[PDB]
Amino acid sequence: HHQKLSARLRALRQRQLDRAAAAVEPDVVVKRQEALAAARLKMQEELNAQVEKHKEKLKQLEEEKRRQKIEMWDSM
């Protein structure tokens, strides 16, 4: 029966359309923004973790450089 085929497509269509319209419902908008803000923050803390690890490395390395110069006078 054809009306059973049509009804099925009709129902799928409203569903799809409603899914498409859902992206710009206010609640969806906010959750999308919350999601993106959350991923951002995750990354910001990780960038910052790295920044500080590298800065620490710098100071270690700068001290290793001081050691070497000092070592140089104190063998002389």
Residue numbers in the entry: 47 to 122
From the manuscript:
Mammalian p97 (also called valosin-containing protein or VCP, cdc48 in yeast, and Ter94 in Drosophila) is a highly conserved AAA (ATPases associated with various cellular activities) protein with a homo-hexameric ring structure; each p97 subunit is composed of two AAA ATPase domains (D1 and D2) preceded by an N-terminal domain (N domain). VIMP, also known as selenoprotein S, is a 21 kDa ER membrane protein. VIMP, together with Derlins, is thought to contribute to the association of the p97-Ufd1-Npl4 complex with the ER membrane, forming an ER membrane-associated module in ERAD. Here we show that VIMP has an essential role in recruiting p97 to the ER membrane.
